[PDB]
Amino acid sequence: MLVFIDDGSTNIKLQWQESDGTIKQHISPNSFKREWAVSFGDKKVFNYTLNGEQYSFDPISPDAVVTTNIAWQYSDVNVVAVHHALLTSGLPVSEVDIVCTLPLTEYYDRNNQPNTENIERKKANFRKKITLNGGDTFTIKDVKVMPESIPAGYEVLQELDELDSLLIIDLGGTTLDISQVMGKLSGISKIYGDSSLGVSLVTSAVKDALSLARTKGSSYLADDIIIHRKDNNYLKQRINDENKISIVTEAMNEALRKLEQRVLNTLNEFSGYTHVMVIGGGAELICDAVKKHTQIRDERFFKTNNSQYDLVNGMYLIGN
Numbered sequence: 001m002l003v004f005i006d007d008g009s010t011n012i013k014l015q016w017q018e019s020d021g022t023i024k025q026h027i028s029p030n031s032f033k034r035e036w037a038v039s040f041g042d043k044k045v046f047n048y049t050l051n052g053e054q055y056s057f058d059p060i061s062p063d064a065v066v067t068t069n070i071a072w073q074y075s076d077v078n079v080v081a082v083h084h085a086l087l088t089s090g091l092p093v094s095e096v097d098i099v100c101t102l103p104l105t106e107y108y109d110r111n112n113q114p115n116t117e118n119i120e121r122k123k124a125n126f127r128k129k130i131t132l133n134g135g136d137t138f139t140i141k142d143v144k145v146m147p148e149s150i151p152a153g154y155e156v157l158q159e160l161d162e163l164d165s166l167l168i169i170d171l172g173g174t175t176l177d178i179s180q181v182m183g184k185l186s187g188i189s190k191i192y193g194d195s196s197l198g199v200s201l202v203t204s205a206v207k208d209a210l211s212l213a214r215t216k217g218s219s220y221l222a223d224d225i226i227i228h229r230k231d232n233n234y235l236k237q238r239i240n241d242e243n244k245i246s247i248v249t250e251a252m253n254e255a256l257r258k259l260e261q262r263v264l265n266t267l268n269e270f271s272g273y274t275h276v277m278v279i280g281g282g283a284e285l286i287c288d289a290v291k292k293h294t295q296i297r298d299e300r301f302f303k304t305n306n307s308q309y310d311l312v313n314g315m316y317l318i319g320n
């Protein structure tokens, strides 16, 4: 049964429908270590035997995740993550069939032209003999593969002018792979690709300014403040002292300043923008960034509330 799993290296983003007739969205974080942290009681984990190795969930060190998007998206850690995501929602352990996501750097070349061997490479990854070490594993039978940024355009691209362009941006923890698509999917123009800076810099800098060590898996407590940067109420709760609120804000700002400092020039490098779509978790951050520089009018500037799930919705409506 088809589950749409945007298997991103920051966190995995999911959408599916069941036998009730209601559509569910879900998210499972990237937090899978190359060791077994077990549990025989209260404090409950997940543990896996992967390809031949020991894997489990704990609030992981940056070792695997702070590498590149490219390195993680085809990994054994990605195999843990996708099968973990279906267990964090809690689906009936049996089949899945999946849609999964590729970088644009990996999908499209020097001429920005495509590679299907990299499509089969994801399917080959999700062919490894993973056991849930306390249950059994969802069997991924059929596999569709898409790139990351592009499929978000799908539902909007329907009406959109076929000679004009839709510039589609994921800003992630890792991902900064960007596509210039054309309307109705008449073609694709130019791509840009990067994962050298992102929200992982921002969210980790907030941990330092708080009271928390530089791991991934306790990310929420810092991710909170990246979300509520437009507030001060949840900031006063979570950054629980006024004397720390500047420190956290200016640490966050140091990262965000230097994120803006590249991505605005990336949208100078992308000549021929006409419509803009902003997606991902950092969609909110690039909305605050790129709108004031690009100066495209709001009828051609797309970003919802959901932000990261905007991507997996465009994937969903292709075929379940």
Ligand SMILES: Nc1ncnc2c1ncn2[C@@H]1O[C@H](COP(=O)(O)OP(=O)(O)O)[C@@H](O)[C@H]1O
Pocket (backbone or CB within 6 Å): 008, 009, 010, 011, 013, 170, 171, 172, 173, 174, 175, 199, 200, 203, 223, 226, 227, 279, 280, 281, 282, 283, 284, 285, 307, 308
């Ligand atoms: N509203 C928001 N404002 C700012 N950052 C956000 C927001 N929502 C999520 N994020 C953060 O953005 C990152 C996730 O980016 P995302 O694009 O969803 O992952 P990926 O790039 O792997 O696709 C996380 O650090 C997440 O906490």
Ligand SMILES: [Mg+2]
Pocket (backbone or CB within 6 Å): 008, 010, 170, 171, 172, 173, 175, 279, 280, 281
């Ligand atoms: Mg992203």
